[PDB]
Enzyme design. Structure first.
Site, PDB file in Angstrom:
ATOM      1  N   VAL A 135       9.122  -0.360   2.855  1.00  0.00           N
ATOM      2  CA  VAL A 135       7.862  -0.587   2.167  1.00  0.00           C
ATOM      3  C   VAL A 135       6.783  -0.841   3.223  1.00  0.00           C
ATOM      4  CG1 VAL A 135       8.685  -2.948   1.833  1.00  0.00           C
ATOM      5  CG2 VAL A 135       6.621  -2.210   0.669  1.00  0.00           C
ATOM      6  N   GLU A 169      -1.953   1.388  12.734  1.00  0.00           N
ATOM      7  CA  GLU A 169      -3.339   1.536  12.318  1.00  0.00           C
ATOM      8  C   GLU A 169      -3.431   1.562  10.790  1.00  0.00           C
ATOM      9  OE1 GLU A 169      -6.822   4.872  13.127  1.00  0.00           O
ATOM     10  OE2 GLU A 169      -4.765   5.369  13.504  1.00  0.00           O
ATOM     11  N   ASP A 202      -5.874   7.405   1.030  1.00  0.00           N
ATOM     12  CA  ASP A 202      -5.017   8.577   1.222  1.00  0.00           C
ATOM     13  C   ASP A 202      -5.648   9.788   0.546  1.00  0.00           C
ATOM     14  OD1 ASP A 202      -4.323   8.063  -1.505  1.00  0.00           O
ATOM     15  OD2 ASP A 202      -2.192   8.305  -1.169  1.00  0.00           O
ATOM     16  N   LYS A 239       2.739  15.641   2.907  1.00  0.00           N
ATOM     17  CA  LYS A 239       2.337  15.601   1.509  1.00  0.00           C
ATOM     18  C   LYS A 239       1.058  14.799   1.396  1.00  0.00           C
ATOM     19  CE  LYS A 239       5.803  11.960   0.576  1.00  0.00           C
ATOM     20  NZ  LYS A 239       7.268  11.814   0.277  1.00  0.00           N
ATOM     21  N   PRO A 240       0.287  14.970   0.294  1.00  0.00           N
ATOM     22  CA  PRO A 240      -1.014  14.271   0.210  1.00  0.00           C
ATOM     23  C   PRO A 240      -0.972  12.759   0.424  1.00  0.00           C
ATOM     24  CG  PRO A 240      -0.973  16.009  -1.401  1.00  0.00           C
ATOM     25  CD  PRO A 240       0.426  15.956  -0.799  1.00  0.00           C
ATOM     26  N   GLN A 241       0.123  12.117   0.006  1.00  0.00           N
ATOM     27  CA  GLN A 241       0.293  10.684   0.131  1.00  0.00           C
ATOM     28  C   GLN A 241       0.593  10.254   1.577  1.00  0.00           C
ATOM     29  OE1 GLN A 241       3.627  11.674  -2.629  1.00  0.00           O
ATOM     30  NE2 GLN A 241       1.949  13.142  -2.124  1.00  0.00           N
ATOM     31  N   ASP A 291       7.918  16.034   6.370  1.00  0.00           N
ATOM     32  CA  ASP A 291       7.533  15.619   5.014  1.00  0.00           C
ATOM     33  C   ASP A 291       6.037  15.483   4.805  1.00  0.00           C
ATOM     34  OD1 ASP A 291       8.270  15.191   2.375  1.00  0.00           O
ATOM     35  OD2 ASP A 291       8.304  13.007   2.592  1.00  0.00           O
ATOM     36  N   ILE A 315       0.810  -1.236   0.000  1.00  0.00           N
ATOM     37  CA  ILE A 315       0.000   0.000   0.000  1.00  0.00           C
ATOM     38  C   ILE A 315       0.840   1.281   0.000  1.00  0.00           C
ATOM     39  CG2 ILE A 315      -2.030  -1.062   1.074  1.00  0.00           C
ATOM     40  CD1 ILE A 315      -1.179   0.080   3.780  1.00  0.00           C
ATOM     41  N   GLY A 316       2.168   1.136   0.023  1.00  0.00           N
ATOM     42  CA  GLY A 316       3.062   2.294   0.138  1.00  0.00           C
ATOM     43  C   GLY A 316       4.550   1.974   0.132  1.00  0.00           C
TER      44      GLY A 316
HETATM   45  C1  1N3 Z   1      -4.248   4.780  -2.940  1.00  0.00           C
HETATM   46  O1  1N3 Z   1      -5.143   4.166  -1.991  1.00  0.00           O
HETATM   47  C2  1N3 Z   1      -4.534   3.956  -0.743  1.00  0.00           C
HETATM   48  C3  1N3 Z   1      -5.177   3.139   0.177  1.00  0.00           C
HETATM   49  C4  1N3 Z   1      -4.632   2.906   1.425  1.00  0.00           C
HETATM   50  C5  1N3 Z   1      -3.420   3.490   1.740  1.00  0.00           C
HETATM   51  C6  1N3 Z   1      -2.779   3.358   3.078  1.00  0.00           C
HETATM   52  N1  1N3 Z   1      -1.495   3.533   3.245  1.00  0.00           N
HETATM   53  C7  1N3 Z   1      -1.269   3.465   4.519  1.00  0.00           C
HETATM   54  C8  1N3 Z   1      -0.113   3.609   5.272  1.00  0.00           C
HETATM   55  N2  1N3 Z   1       1.212   3.841   4.824  1.00  0.00           N
HETATM   56  C9  1N3 Z   1       1.416   4.115   3.404  1.00  0.00           C
HETATM   57  C10 1N3 Z   1       1.092   5.575   3.122  1.00  0.00           C
HETATM   58  C11 1N3 Z   1       1.856   6.522   4.021  1.00  0.00           C
HETATM   59  N3  1N3 Z   1       3.261   6.502   3.701  1.00  0.00           N
HETATM   60  C12 1N3 Z   1       4.162   5.790   4.464  1.00  0.00           C
HETATM   61  O2  1N3 Z   1       3.863   5.212   5.507  1.00  0.00           O
HETATM   62  C13 1N3 Z   1       5.566   5.731   3.958  1.00  0.00           C
HETATM   63  C14 1N3 Z   1       6.043   6.598   2.829  1.00  0.00           C
HETATM   64  N4  1N3 Z   1       6.166   8.041   3.143  1.00  0.00           N
HETATM   65  C15 1N3 Z   1       6.245   4.390   4.048  1.00  0.00           C
HETATM   66  C16 1N3 Z   1       6.643   5.470   4.982  1.00  0.00           C
HETATM   67  C17 1N3 Z   1      -0.310   3.487   6.647  1.00  0.00           C
HETATM   68 BR1  1N3 Z   1       1.139   3.632   7.852  1.00  0.00          BR
HETATM   69  C18 1N3 Z   1      -1.538   3.266   7.231  1.00  0.00           C
HETATM   70  N5  1N3 Z   1      -2.644   3.141   6.516  1.00  0.00           N
HETATM   71  C19 1N3 Z   1      -2.577   3.227   5.216  1.00  0.00           C
HETATM   72  N6  1N3 Z   1      -3.492   3.145   4.258  1.00  0.00           N
HETATM   73  C20 1N3 Z   1      -2.775   4.304   0.820  1.00  0.00           C
HETATM   74  C21 1N3 Z   1      -3.321   4.537  -0.424  1.00  0.00           C
END
Ligand code: 1N3
EC number: 2.7.11.22
Length: 286
Positions: free
Chosen positions: A17, A76, A81, A124-126, A122, A10-11
């Protein structure tokens, strides 16, 4: 990682990862960050600090699993996102009451972190995660100061970082959040730079090249060059139409060049823009 069952990726970031995963033991569905080490004890004590930094607007770190000399972070899980949500809303745009709720909630998250002297660094939308209850949460939070310094996005970088300020403040999070705000409102990224100088120069074009008048001490910053082109400032009415006067007032104070004049998270929560704040629920398609 023997207790977990990787569901889907998912990321990703620089340090590892992230997988949606199911706890084989307990049924629990979680986001599992696999940290790519090549161990450092200083990094361990730093992450353990983040287990204490608990807030409804910070993605909850469930556990830290340091084992076989690997590090895993169990968070969690949230189902979407803000990037995907913004992309899914791009034809009509996110309704302003929802924009305002999300800005207020993130500002609450930041007031909290920042009161504990913790910066995100950091935003950001993501890294902003939403649920079906209308909540928005800061993710990947303080995991930069741990190990030390994919194309990393520069679009939400504060100008003092890009100018080489090594000891920047909580104000860098307000800048980033300002940029995210603008982007929700306009449905285009405010400063989409594809390198540091392009990013800096996109900021300069919009907000004007900074000088000693608007930003005392700027000409003495490490990467400041007297030879930077001298762009005049544009009006905010051009930058974020059709944001209302209160929104544009708050946004301007979140985008002050001088990090010591830039509004704090706490002060921003008192801004007239949130007189009429509510908590709408978004319409999420999962
Ligand atoms: C595009 O649809 C999505 C659906 C679910 C997620 C999702 N991603 C996460 C996530 N982590 C991935 C997104 C945030 N980024 C990070 O954690 C990184 C990158 N900056 C790995 C450190 C966490 Br923790 C918890 N719940 C989540 N749910 C992301 C996109």
């Amino acid at each position: 990682m023997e207790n977990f069952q990787k569901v889907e990726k998912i990321g990703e970031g620089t340090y590892g990862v992230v997988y949606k995963a199911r706890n084989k033991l307990t049924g629990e569905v979680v986001a599992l960050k696999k940290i790519r080490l090549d161990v450092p004890s200083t990094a361990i004590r730093e992450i353990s600090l983040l287990k204490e930094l608990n807030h409804p607007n910070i993605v909850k770190l469930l556990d830290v699993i340091h084992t076989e000399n690997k590090l895993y972070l169990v968070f969690e899980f949230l189902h979407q996102d803000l990037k995907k949500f913004m992309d899914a809303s791009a034809l009509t745009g996110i309704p302003l009451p929802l924009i305002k709720s999300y800005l207020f909630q993130l500002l609450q998250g930041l007031a909290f972190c920042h009161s504990h002297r913790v910066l995100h660094r950091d935003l950001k939308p993501q890294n902003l995660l939403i649920n079906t209850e209308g909540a928005i949460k800061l993710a990947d939070f303080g995991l930069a100061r741990a190990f030390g310094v994919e194309v990393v996005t520069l679009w939400y970088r504060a100008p003092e970082i890009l100018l080489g300020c090594k000891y920047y403040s909580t104000a860098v999070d307000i800048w980033s959040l300002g940029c995210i705000f603008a982007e929700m409102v306009t449905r285009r990224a405010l400063f989409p730079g594809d390198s540091e100088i392009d990013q800096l120069f996109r900021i300069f074009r919009t907000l004007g090249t900074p000088d000693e008048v608007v930003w005392p001490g700027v000409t003495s910053m490490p990467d400041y060059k007297p030879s930077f082109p001298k762009w005049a400032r544009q009006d905010f009415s051009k930058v974020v139409p059709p944001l209302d006067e209160d929104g544009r007032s708050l946004l301007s104070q979140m985008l002050h060049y001088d990090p010591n004049k830039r509004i704090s998270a706490k002060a921003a929560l008192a801004h007239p823009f949130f007189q009429d704040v509510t908590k709408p629920v978004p319409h999420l398609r999962l």
